[PDB]
Symmetry: C3
Subunit: 29 residues, 3 copies
Protein backbone atom coordinates (compact mmCIF):
# COMPACT_ATOMS: atom_id res chain seq x y z
CA UNK A 1 0.00 0.00 0.00
CA UNK A 2 2.76 2.53 0.73
CA UNK A 3 4.46 1.85 -2.60
CA UNK A 4 1.10 2.24 -4.39
CA UNK A 5 0.67 5.68 -2.71
CA UNK A 6 4.20 6.78 -3.60
CA UNK A 7 3.70 5.65 -7.22
CA UNK A 8 0.40 7.46 -7.57
CA UNK A 9 1.90 10.69 -6.12
CA UNK A 10 4.89 10.45 -8.49
CA UNK A 11 2.53 9.89 -11.47
CA UNK A 12 0.50 12.98 -10.46
CA UNK A 13 3.64 15.10 -10.06
CA UNK A 14 4.69 14.07 -13.60
CA UNK A 15 1.20 14.71 -15.01
CA UNK A 16 1.18 18.24 -13.46
CA UNK A 17 4.61 19.02 -14.95
CA UNK A 18 3.37 17.82 -18.33
CA UNK A 19 0.18 19.93 -18.06
CA UNK A 20 2.03 23.09 -17.04
CA UNK A 21 4.38 22.54 -20.05
CA UNK A 22 1.46 22.14 -22.48
CA UNK A 23 -0.29 25.23 -20.94
CA UNK A 24 2.85 27.30 -21.49
CA UNK A 25 3.07 26.09 -25.08
CA UNK A 26 -0.55 27.01 -25.72
CA UNK A 27 -0.28 30.38 -24.09
CA UNK A 28 2.99 31.50 -25.70
CA UNK A 29 3.56 29.24 -28.70
Amino acid sequence: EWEALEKKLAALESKCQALEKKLEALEHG
Copy 2:
Protein backbone atom coordinates in the same frame (compact mmCIF):
# COMPACT_ATOMS: atom_id res chain seq x y z
CA GLU B 1 -4.74 9.42 8.64
CA TRP B 2 -4.11 7.04 5.76
CA GLU B 3 -7.69 6.92 4.50
CA ALA B 4 -7.91 10.75 4.37
CA LEU B 5 -4.65 10.95 2.38
CA GLU B 6 -5.95 8.34 -0.08
CA LYS B 7 -9.17 10.35 -0.48
CA LYS B 8 -7.14 13.54 -1.14
CA LEU B 9 -5.03 11.64 -3.75
CA ALA B 10 -8.11 10.31 -5.50
CA ALA B 11 -9.63 13.84 -5.62
CA LEU B 12 -6.36 15.21 -7.01
CA GLU B 13 -6.30 12.45 -9.70
CA SER B 14 -9.87 13.44 -10.68
CA LYS B 15 -8.89 17.15 -10.79
CA CYS B 16 -5.79 16.50 -12.95
CA GLN B 17 -7.78 14.41 -15.39
CA ALA B 18 -10.26 17.25 -15.72
CA LEU B 19 -7.48 19.76 -16.38
CA GLU B 20 -6.02 17.50 -19.07
CA LYS B 21 -9.38 17.37 -20.86
CA LYS B 22 -9.87 21.12 -20.57
CA LEU B 23 -6.41 21.82 -21.90
CA GLU B 24 -7.10 19.47 -24.88
CA ALA B 25 -10.31 21.47 -25.55
CA LEU B 26 -8.38 24.73 -25.62
CA GLU B 27 -5.75 23.31 -28.00
CA HIS B 28 -8.71 22.63 -30.43
CA GLY B 29 -10.40 26.06 -30.11
Copy 3:
Protein backbone atom coordinates in the same frame (compact mmCIF):
# COMPACT_ATOMS: atom_id res chain seq x y z
CA GLU C 1 8.74 9.53 5.34
CA TRP C 2 4.99 9.76 6.00
CA GLU C 3 5.18 13.51 6.79
CA ALA C 4 7.21 14.01 3.57
CA LEU C 5 4.43 12.29 1.62
CA GLU C 6 1.80 14.61 3.17
CA LYS C 7 3.81 17.81 2.55
CA LYS C 8 4.38 16.69 -1.10
CA LEU C 9 0.63 16.06 -1.60
CA ALA C 10 -0.14 19.52 -0.13
CA ALA C 11 2.35 21.07 -2.60
CA LEU C 12 0.75 19.20 -5.54
CA GLU C 13 -2.71 20.35 -4.43
CA SER C 14 -1.52 24.00 -4.49
CA LYS C 15 0.12 23.53 -7.92
CA CYS C 16 -3.08 21.97 -9.37
CA GLN C 17 -5.21 24.74 -8.04
CA ALA C 18 -2.83 27.18 -9.74
CA LEU C 19 -3.09 25.26 -13.01
CA GLU C 20 -6.87 25.27 -12.79
CA LYS C 21 -7.07 29.02 -12.35
CA LYS C 22 -4.54 29.66 -15.16
CA LEU C 23 -6.42 27.38 -17.53
CA GLU C 24 -9.67 29.27 -16.63
CA ALA C 25 -7.95 32.51 -17.63
CA LEU C 26 -6.62 31.11 -20.93
CA GLU C 27 -10.04 29.73 -21.77
CA HIS C 28 -11.22 33.36 -21.64
CA GLY C 29 -8.32 34.81 -23.70
